[PDB]
Design an enzyme around this catalytic site. Structure first.
Site, PDB file in Angstrom:
ATOM      1  CB  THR A   1     -30.350  10.539 -20.675  1.00  0.00           C
ATOM      2  OG1 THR A   1     -29.268  10.564 -19.732  1.00  0.00           O
ATOM      3  CG2 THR A   1     -29.868  11.109 -22.015  1.00  0.00           C
ATOM      4  CD  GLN A   2     -34.608  14.567 -20.231  1.00  0.00           C
ATOM      5  OE1 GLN A   2     -33.411  14.796 -20.402  1.00  0.00           O
ATOM      6  NE2 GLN A   2     -35.382  15.325 -19.458  1.00  0.00           N
TER       7      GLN A   2
ATOM      8  CG  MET B   1     -27.071  10.544 -14.566  1.00  0.00           C
ATOM      9  SD  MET B   1     -25.953  11.709 -15.365  1.00  0.00           S
ATOM     10  CE  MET B   1     -25.756  10.924 -16.958  1.00  0.00           C
TER      11      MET B   1
END
Ligand SMILES: O=C(C[C@H](C(=O)O)C1CCCCC1)Nc1ccc2ccc(-c3nc(-c4ccccc4)cs3)cc2n1
Ligand SMILES: [Mg+2]
Lengths: 222, 211, 235, 250, 231, 240, 244, 233
Positions: free
Chosen positions: H1-2, H107
């Site tokens: 996730t970013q 993810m």
């Protein structure tokens, strides 16, 4: 934060006849209030006289269908080109779905075809793999709009025979393919009026002993 | 959902409802909440449908392998334990499963309650789901060991009806089962709508409801 | 010394060829396939009279529709049977159906060549896998430690195999009944066995579509032995 | 690739001999002579700097090595095997002791650790034994001064005085006659130089001899002042000049 | 002699004996023929039985809708290599929506077989394969040797007595290559080719095995009464 | 890891390592098992080359696997401990997962499986041990006696012996043991077990061990004096 | 490949013997003799150091007798380096037991554990076995005073009196002759030293060639004391028993 | 996730009778800062495909390298790399779609929205969309971000359904695309005047136009607009 899921809308409908089965679905693909495509096929011929539609999150739906089509291919390789029966395909799909119990395929899946006695069959799945054989099933956005109508017009629920006043039910007479397609078209036309995610087009796949046939009908584009 | 099961003189009765819901919407009027593991073993279903189906069909695999290895039928005690040990592996991971394993073995009729926490309880009577409280009332006041098969089947049926009436997430139809030493016997699908009116007239119950 | 997976100059795997010699020393097992069912029979060959012969288990159930007989180093067969039973039941779990006899046999044979330097050597046991499915009907397979499996109308394995196979060559025809096949296995077993054949040192079994796989009682086999003696004395 | 020699290369023969250990001891026998002598107030270890070429700078090759501030080592046999054992010995003194107890290990326990490493090369898969015998001299508070020998097998023995390598048999006889329990450190150094002269052929001076002691604390070699309890290393390597001074009084 | 104990050892003349012994297993195997035109590619295989009670060992394996092979030698090794091809054909479809080129399939088989010839512990594959297929550049026929060598050919044969069929195809080269848009005539040429390798025995109904792939023809195998037409 | 294939086939179709493991069993002290009508007796030889032994603490030849099953053996003593430990762990593992104690047949099948696994696993040699496993199944009064060997094969026996000079005592048992009428009492069963060992043992002093196992977890080991009374009575009848 | 150079340490001979175990036992037969004698009121451990030197530092030396815990000790015969590996493992095992159950480890349990480790090297791993034989002398509240022995095969047995190392045949005969069940520690001390004095390959038995130890309830009231004898104390007991 | 840092806005495209057109502006935004003005977001693959990318630019540069490596890898042991076994638009898309869905399933997505435009071997038009979720769809017109809200409505007036594709010429289609880019410049706060446009035609091949500008803009009426209600001056 990254949300790995999405909602592409869409609505599907499976009905089992006496010696046939239908699997219908609208062709509209959406995100939020935008239209992505007015014609993006959602119901697929998977081989062995089986049709399938994974409604909900299109990325997971395309992945599941792609995997099941692959499972049919390997079933032929491994078991001497044996035909995959609808009940066997249903059980296989349960195991495909439960392989992701903790990161599910966000789809409600329906398959349709004929059982080993030649009778019409529909099987219905939840995202985590619960399944069961059914006669009538609407899935997706406008499922709640359609199913009550099918309870009334397919299974004749709450309908009694005039003169008896509730003492004698309306007899459960079998429906023809032409009669079923009418109920499908009216179901989607009504859904299109009251549900913003439903419209553009309707594609129906009919399954008989002769094979898989397609029918397409326009729907309102607003 | 409402499920029940009880032991008695002539085996064990198992009765369940048939409703499935997605919020307020009734997604299914008729789902099978009993799983036929083998001809001498049954399993009820409450919680996540997928979890109950998957793990109990997997229990059947293991109970069948037992028979091939040992040439004997597995006990209800051992089958219930195998199932509780599967739940114990995905402990904390979010499974939702409440079931009663019903059968007949060398020790006579057997009944075990098993849930997702790995709990495993032996008992004469159990009931699970959103409507279990309503069912327990009918069961507790009418249950005897001296029950006939005819009366016992009616008790489990009438108990589900009580729950289907009051509980909004319970209803549809009643599925009955009777487990004997010669195996389980299915005693049909009974629509609650039709059954309700029938019971009201014949029994005189549900006076508050107009029919 | 030399590799376990080594080829000979003739193009054969030494270890596979040597395991075949161990199978030749094993007790006789015979299988006959008919349109009414498949019959499986074995020589028990107890090493002593104090050994309780009913504990000798050389015929085994894999599923309700598949049976199996063994010959050679019979201890090696236990893991093969375990795999077969697991494969049969697992397929029933995944596909809600019985598994094809050929597919079951192929699954067992996939283990065969998983040896090297996986297990340290090939299996020292041959299997006669008999069963029935809806697609190909009554079937009999011979599963070797080479990984190869042939389907047979009739087959004998073990110490009296080439003598028994020659006898099966003459006796088998496509119109054999189940009763005729039973007597034929008993006849050929009695011929190749060292000791005198009776209900205690020989065992029969069959697989039919209706009743599935069944191992015969000693009382049931004894009657078939008595029926055999009388029909041989009849001419 | 992968190390596929997971089996022992040292095994018992029918006579009960462990061949590779015996052969390792034979390699030690061919090695240059080294010795150790224990005094009342110190220990001395010595050996010959057998230079392979006169163009080689023999000062850069150290046969006598510091393991801890109070422990030193010397060897006979294969030099490269010694060098790596010293690297491991220095490290194990930290990892298995100093980082736990906050102090340097006593001589006997460091010896025990070195011995373990040498034993494992005698049993583990795909290795040969070390081809060296070590002489480890040291001091610690509770055991005082000590001198240990460690063989290729991993066996170790405490000595009052001993010698290993080329002329060990003759040197051990020479030491038996001269050793007593009242020797001072300077007396032990003198005896070490006498003993070592017998096994040396060519030049015998401070540039061809390597000699170190375990004796008094050297606060001049500590590198810092201010902590009373820290008084400096007991290990000290004698200079070329310091050796030559004692060869005039020889 | 002293250099044939394992696959990791060259002989003094630079030979690999274990690979040569694996090659020998193919020569013991039953004959199989491969040939193609510009529109179709055909496999013909003589199946072998154990005895009269036994079935005839299957020789042809389908890899994809557009590709498959025939085997000669250790059958279990063919199952392993054909399984690998099935996976590679399948990887190409799922990831790239692309049917695997026959030439690339040969390159993949070569590299898989090669790894078994250079490492300790393992063994070479003991089987030869004839791969046919129809891709974007038309019909193709490949010959696989467990040494790793893969060769694209108009026609060929492997197994016992395969030299007779190979000579026939070498004469008929100019004729059978021109058989375009006629599957039955191309099979006839293959059945006539494999007949040059027969002795004592002849082609019966449960003896013969045929496979074909082409422009508008998925890979299909013919056995039993389906090949009685060509006997 | 050490992966070397030690148990392999030879040109004549023999696995020599498994066969040489049987030679280790032949060297081991004699062990015998006899089942009566309502009991099983396990007899074991103790070689009298070792005196000054402490018999209190010396590992006994018969080992309890559970409260209702026992295991004796012939062959390498150290090897037998590994099988016994594994068997004991499996017995508790079965009770824990299935809620019933192991059957004698199941426990035998497990031990035999361990022995088999060591004949086709890399880097290991076969167990130089044959075992006699005896007991009574839970809530069952039928006696059980099984035998295992290095190859991994197992079978049930009315009476059986293993170890050195087992050929002789098996000869005795084959002519003395009647299947139609097995030793009806504990006395008769023990007497026959002692008699069989007296064909081979040497002196009937501390060389014979006897362990009686009865139904419902009733297991007891006879003392020196109790056994000595059998030895006395046997020879006094023999003097005739 | 590597197979060429593998000696195969874990295989049976045609006669059903383990080559490496038998050869390890041959090695041990050349080691210094160690004797253990069990009495009613204690245990004696006596052992002979191998051809020593006058320049060996005896008072800080230990090659035969080792302490496993406060209740258990061992006498070694064979490769000393091999023995120290096993000894440290046994010391750890005893402490693991004490941490787990809060009771001192029973003697047999410790002996079985070490013997199982030895067994493993004969059945798997492809490594040479430990060329060591132990005599275990210990006490616990179940069986009281106990003597055990283990050898490279991993087999262990209990004893009233026992010898390992060199000349065990001669030593065992002498012990079997003079040993009695009602014997006491002071008598057992004398027997052990007399046996070594007759079986030794040396010209005479002296203090510098011996290691000695006792385990006595001769500790103030119900408790056990281990005594590893000092060089001067071995010299005194040699004079007391009338050997020097 | 970013989270996306340097970003590219709308990518718009449509089918016409003989091929496809695709366009995208040359801006790399850093939040509200219009930081980089020379960024090419249309990346040709061979002479039959153009991949248009929006979203995170660092992830775009990563995809750009995957595609460059895909061409290299396809040429390996391939004598027909510039002919029958050349990379097709459908191959390139399915590859990217496989990568995008795999990354979201770990993810750790590639924070992009991609449109693959091209012409197949048989002359068929190819136009399909894929994004960070692995979601795919096809339509006669496709657009990302703001383009979906403003450009599609304008482009769908030209090609409302499949049957309108043969009736649409390249001049008409290009005119519609250029008009749409002007509208986005009027109304998208993260857009630039400078853009690139690519045409893939089954007859004339790949035409790649750089350094295009939005022109013919209407601003004059602004002079008459005064205040926010009541103000007259
Ligand atoms: O167990 C519960 C819910 C709990 C309950 O009512 O007590 C709830 C308490 C109230 C809040 C929510 C949880 N539901 C059950 C139980 C057994 C079930 C057995 C089979 C099914 C099947 N459902 C499909 C299916 C359905 C919808 C679409 C497609 C397939 C097939 S089978 C569903 C089942 N659902
Ligand atoms: Mg609408």
């Amino acid at each position: 934060q990254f949300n790995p899921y999405g909602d592409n809308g869409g609505t599907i409908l499976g009905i089992a006849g006496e010696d046939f089965a239908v699997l219908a679905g609208d062709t509209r693909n959406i995100t939020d209030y935008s239209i992505n495509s007015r014609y993006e096929p959602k119901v697929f011929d998977c081989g062995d006289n089986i049709v399938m539609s994974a409604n909900g999150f299109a990325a997971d739906g395309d992945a599941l269908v792609k995997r099941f089509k692959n499972s049919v291919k390997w079933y032929h390789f491994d078991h001497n080109d044996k035909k995959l029966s609808i009940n066997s395909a249903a059980r296989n799909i349960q195991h495909l779905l439960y392989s992701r119990r903790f990161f599910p395929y966000y789809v409600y899946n329906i398959i349709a075809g004929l059982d080993e006695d030649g009778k019409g069959a529909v099987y219905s799945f939840d995202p985590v793999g619960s399944y069961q054989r059914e006669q009538c099933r609407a899935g997706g956005a406008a499922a709640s709009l359609i199913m009550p109508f099918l309870d009334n017009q397919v299974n004749f629920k709450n309908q009694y025979e005039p003169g008896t006043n509730g003492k004698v039910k309306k007899p459960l007479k079998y429906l023809s393919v032409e009669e079923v397609i009418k109920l499908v078209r009216d179901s989607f036309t009504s859904a299109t009026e009251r549900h913003i995610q439903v419209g553009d087009g309707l594609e129906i796949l009919i399954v008989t002993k002769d094979g898989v046939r397609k029918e397409f009908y326009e729907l309102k584009r607003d | 959902t409402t499920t029940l099961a009880f032991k008695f003189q002539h085996g064990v009765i198992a009765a369940v409802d048939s409703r499935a819901s997605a919020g307020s919407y009734i997604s299914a009027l008729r789902v099978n909440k009993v799983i036929e593991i083998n001809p001498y073993l049954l399993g009820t279903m409450s919680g996540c449908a997928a979890d109950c189906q998957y793990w109990e069909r997997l229990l059947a695999k293991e109970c069948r392998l037992y028979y091939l290895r040992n040439g004997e039928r597995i006990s209800v005690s051992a089958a219930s334990k195998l199932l509780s040990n599967m739940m114990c592996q995905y402990r904390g991971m979010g499974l939702s499963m409440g079931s009663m394993i019903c059968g007949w073995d060398k020790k006579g009729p057997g009944l075990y309650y098993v849930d997702e926490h790995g709990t495993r309880l032996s008992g004469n009577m159990f009931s699970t789901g959103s409507g279990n409280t309503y069912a327990y009332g009918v069961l507790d006041s009418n249950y005897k060991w001296d029950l006939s098969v005819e009366d016992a089947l009616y008790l489990g049926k009438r108990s589900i009806l009580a729950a289907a009436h009051r509980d909004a997430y319970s209803g549809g139809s009643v599925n009955l089962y009777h487990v004997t030493e010669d195996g389980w016997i299915y005693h049909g699908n009974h629509d609650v709508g039709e059954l309700f009116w029938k019971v009201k007239e014949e029994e005189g119950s549900f006076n508050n409801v107009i029919g | 010394d030399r590799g376990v997976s080594t080829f000979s100059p003739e193009g054969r795997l030494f270890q596979v060829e040597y395991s075949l010699e161990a199978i030749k020393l094993g007790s006789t097992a015979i299988g006959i396939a008919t349109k009414e069912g498949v019959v499986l029979g074995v020589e028990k060959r107890a090493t002593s009279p104090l050994l309780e012969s009913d504990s000798i288990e050389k015929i085994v159930e894999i599923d309700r529709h598949i049976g199996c007989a063994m010959s050679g180093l019979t201890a090696d067969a236990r893991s093969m049977i375990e795999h077969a039973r697991t494969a049969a039941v697992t397929h029933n779990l995944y596909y809600d159906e019985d598994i094809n006899v050929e597919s079951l046999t192929q699954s067992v044979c996939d283990l065969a060549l998983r040896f090297g330097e996986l297990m340290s050597r090939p299996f020292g046991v041959a299997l006669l896998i008999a069963g029935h499915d809806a697609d190909d009907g009554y079937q009999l397979f011979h599963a070797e430690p080479s990984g190869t499996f042939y389907r047979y109308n009739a087959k004998a394995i073990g110490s009296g195999s080439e003598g028994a196979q020659a006898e099966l060559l003459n006796e088998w025809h496509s119109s054999l009944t189940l009763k005729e096949a039973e007597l034929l296995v008993l006849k050929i077993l009695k011929q190749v066995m060292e000791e005198k054949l009776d209900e205690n040192n020989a065992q029969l079994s069959c697989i039919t579509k209706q009743d599935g796989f069944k191992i015969y009682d000693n009382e049931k086999t004894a009657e078939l032995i008595k029926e055999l003696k009388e029909k041989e004395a009849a001419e | 690739m992968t190390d596929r020699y997971s089996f022992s290369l040292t095994t018992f023969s029918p006579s009960g001999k462990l061949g590779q250990i015996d052969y390792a001891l034979t390699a030690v026998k061919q090695g240059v002579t080294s010795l150790g002598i224990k005094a009342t107030n110190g220990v001395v270890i010595a050996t010959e700097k057998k230079s392979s070429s006169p163009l080689a700078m023999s000062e850069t090759l150290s046969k006598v090595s510091l393991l801890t501030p109070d422990i030193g080592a010397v060897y006979s046999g294969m030099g490269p095997d010694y060098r790596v054992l010293v690297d491991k010995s220095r490290k194990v003194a930290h990892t298995s002791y100093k980082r736990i107890y906050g102090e340097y290990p006593p001589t006997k326990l460091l010896v025990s650790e070195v011995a373990k490493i040498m034993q494992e090369a005698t049993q583990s898969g795909g290795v040969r034994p070390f081809g060296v015998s070590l002489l480890i001299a040291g001091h610690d508070e509770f055991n005082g001064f000590s001198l240990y020998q460690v063989d290729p097998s991993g066996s170790y023995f405490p000595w009052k005085a001993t010698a290993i390598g080329k002329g060990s048999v003759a040197a051990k006889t020479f030491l038996e006659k001269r050793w007593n329990d009242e020797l001072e450190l300077e007396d032990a150094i003198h005896i070490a130089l006498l003993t070592l002269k017998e096994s040396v052929e060519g030049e015998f001076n401070g540039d061809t001899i390597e000699l170190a002691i375990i004796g008094d604390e050297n606060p001049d070699l500590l590198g810092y002042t201010g902590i009373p309890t820290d008084k400096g290393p007991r290990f000290r390597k004698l200079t070329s000049q310091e050796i030559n001074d004692r060869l005039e009084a020889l | 002699n002293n250099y044939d104990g394992d696959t990791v050892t060259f002989s003094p003349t630079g030979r690999l004996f274990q690979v040569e012994y694996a090659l020998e297993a193919i020569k013991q195997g039953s004959v199989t023929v491969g040939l193609r035109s510009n529109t179709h590619a055909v496999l013909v295989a003589l199946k072998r039985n154990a005895d009269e009670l036994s079935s005839y060992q299957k020789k042809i394996i389908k890899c994809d809708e557009h590709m498959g092979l025939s085997l000669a030698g250790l059958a279990p090794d063919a199952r392993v290599l054909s399984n690998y091809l099935r996976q590679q054909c399948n990887y190409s479809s799922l990831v790239f929506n692309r049917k695997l080129a026959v030439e690339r399939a040969g390159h993949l088989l070569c590299d898989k077989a090669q790894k078994n010839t250079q490492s300790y512990g393992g063994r070479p594959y003991g089987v030869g394969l004839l791969i046919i297929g129809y891709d974007k550049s038309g019909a193709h026929l490949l010959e696989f040797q467990p040494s790793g060598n893969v060769t694209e050919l108009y026609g060929t044969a492997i197994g016992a007595r395969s030299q007779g069929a190979k000579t026939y195809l070498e004469r008929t080269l100019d004729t059978f290559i021109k058989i375009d848009g006629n599957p039955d005539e191309l099979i006839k040429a293959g059945v006539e080719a494999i007949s040059q390798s027969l002795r004592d025995e002849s082609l019966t109904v449960d003896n013969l095995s045929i496979a074909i792939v082409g422009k508008d023809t998925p890979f299909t195998i013919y056995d039993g009464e389906a090949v009685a037409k060509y006997i | 890891g050490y992966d070397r294939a030690l148990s392999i086939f030879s040109p004549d179709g023999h696995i020599f390592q498994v066969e040489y493991a049987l030679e280790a069993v032949k060297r081991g002290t004699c062990a015998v098992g006899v089942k009566g009508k309502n009991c099983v007796v396990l007899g074991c030889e103790r070689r009298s080359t070792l005196k000054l032994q402490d018999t209190r603490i010396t590992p006994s030849k018969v080992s309890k696997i559970d409260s209702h099953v026992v295991l004796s053996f012939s062959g390498l003593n150290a090897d037998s401990r590994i099988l016994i430990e594994k068997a004991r762990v499996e017995a508790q593992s079965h009770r824990l997962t299935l809620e019933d104690p192991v059957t004698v047949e199941y426990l035998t099948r497990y031990v035999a499986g361990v022995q088999q696994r060591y004949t086709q696993s890399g880097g290991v040699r076969p167990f130089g041990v044959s075992t006699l496993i005896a007991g009574f199944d839970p809530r069952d009064d039928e006696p059980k006696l099984y035998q295992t060997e290095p190859s991994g094969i197992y079978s049930s026996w009315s009476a059986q012996t293993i170890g050195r000079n087992s050929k002789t005592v098996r000869e005795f048992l084959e002519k003395n043991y009647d299947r139609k009428e097995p030793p009806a009492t504990v006395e008769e069963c023990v007497k026959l077990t002692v008699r069989s060992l007296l064909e081979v043992v040497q002196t009937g002093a501390k060389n014979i061990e006897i362990t009686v196992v009865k139904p419902d977890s009733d297991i007891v080991a006879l003392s020196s004096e109790e056994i000595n009374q059998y030895v006395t009575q046997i020879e006094q009848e023999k003097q005739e | 490949g590597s197979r060429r150079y593998d000696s195969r340490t874990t295989i049976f001979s045609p006669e059903g013997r383990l080559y490496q175990v038998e050869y390890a036992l041959e090695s041990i037969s050349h080691a210094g003799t160690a004797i253990g004698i069990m009495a009613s009121d204690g245990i004696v451990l006596a052992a002979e150091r191998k051809v020593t030197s006058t320049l060996l530092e005896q008072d800080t030396s230990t090659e035969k007798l080792y302490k496993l815990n406060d209740k258990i000790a061992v006498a070694v015969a064979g490769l000393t380096a091999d023995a120290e590996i096993l000894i440290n493992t046994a010391r750890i095992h005893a402490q693991n037991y004490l941490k787990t159950y809060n009771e001192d480890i029973p003697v047999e349990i410790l002996v079985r554990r070490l013997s199982d480790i030895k067994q493993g090297y004969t059945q798997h791993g492809g490594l040479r076995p430990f060329g060591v034989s132990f005599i275990y002398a210990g006490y616990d509240d179940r069986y009281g005073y106990q003597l055990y022995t283990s050898n490279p095969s991993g087999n262990y047995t209990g004893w009233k009196a026992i010898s390992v190392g060199a000349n065990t045949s001669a030593a065992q005969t002498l012990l079997q002759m003079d040993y009695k069940d009602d014997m006491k520690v002071d008598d057992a001390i004398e027997l052990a030293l007399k046996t070594l004095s007759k079986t030794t390959d040396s010209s005479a038995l002296t203090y510098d060639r011996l290691e000695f130890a006792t385990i006595r309830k001769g500790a103030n009231d119900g408790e056990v004391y281990q005594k590893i004898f000092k060089p001067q104390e071995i010299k005194d007991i040699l004079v007391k028993t009338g050997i020097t | 996730t970013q989270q996306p840092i340097v970003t590219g806005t709308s990518v718009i495209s449509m089918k016409y009778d003989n091929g496809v057109i695709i366009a995208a502006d040359n801006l790399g935004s850093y939040g509200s800062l219009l930081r980089f003005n020379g960024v090419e977001r249309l990346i040709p693959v061979g002479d039959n495909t153009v991949v248009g990318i929006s979203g995170d630019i660092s992830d775009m540069q990563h995809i750009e390298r995957l595609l460059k490596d895909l061409v290299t890898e396809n040429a390996y042991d391939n004598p027909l790399a510039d002919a029958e076994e050349a990379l097709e638009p459908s191959y390139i898309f399915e590859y990217l779609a496989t990568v995008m869905y795999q990354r979201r399933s770990k993810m750790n997505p590639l924070w992009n929205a991609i449109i693959v435009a091209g012409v197949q071997s048989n002359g068929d038009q190819f136009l399909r969309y894929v994004n960070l979720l692995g979601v795919t769809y096809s339509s006669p017109t496709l657009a990302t971000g703001f383009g979906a809200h403003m450009a599609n409505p304008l482009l769908r007036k030209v090609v409302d359904r499949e049957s309108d594709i043969p009736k649409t010429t390249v001049q008409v289609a290009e005119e519609a695309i250029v008009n749409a880019m002007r509208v986005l410049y009027y109304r998208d706060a993260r857009s630039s005047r400078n853009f690139s446009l690519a045409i893939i035609d089954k007859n004339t091949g790949l035409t790649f136009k750089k350094n295009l500008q939005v022109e013919n803009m209407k601003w004059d009426f602004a002079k008459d607009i005064k205040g926010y209600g009541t103000q007259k001056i």
